[PDB]
Predict the structure.
Amino acid sequence: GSSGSSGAHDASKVRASGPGLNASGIPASLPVEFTIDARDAGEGLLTVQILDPEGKPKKANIRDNGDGTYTVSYLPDMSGRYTITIKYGGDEIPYSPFRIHALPTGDASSGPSSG
């Protein structure tokens, strides 16, 4: 809709760093978690969404650090290009969508096992 909150927040002030946000490629079938260091990201609520390389909604977890940052963990069961959409109080960061690649690590312990 035309009408919008237009609060006092800036997603551009959100920094994305960690293994989960590895541009070089992360090992699929393994629990990975990144860290969103945002100080002046605004007085809103951070949101994270991951869509498998097939086009389906995944399960992601978000934690509050309080030290001006945040932490998120997820387990990319499937492999390929994952679409991670990060929005702040209704403002998609200038980095999203985050194009991440998941490489198959063949055998993976303490992870997703189907039989």
Observations:
- The first strand starts at residue 14 and ends at 17.
- Strands lie at 14-17, 26-27, 32-38, 46-51, 60-64, 70-74, 80-88, 98-103.
- DSSP finds no helices and eight strands in the chain.
- The radius of gyration is 15 Å.
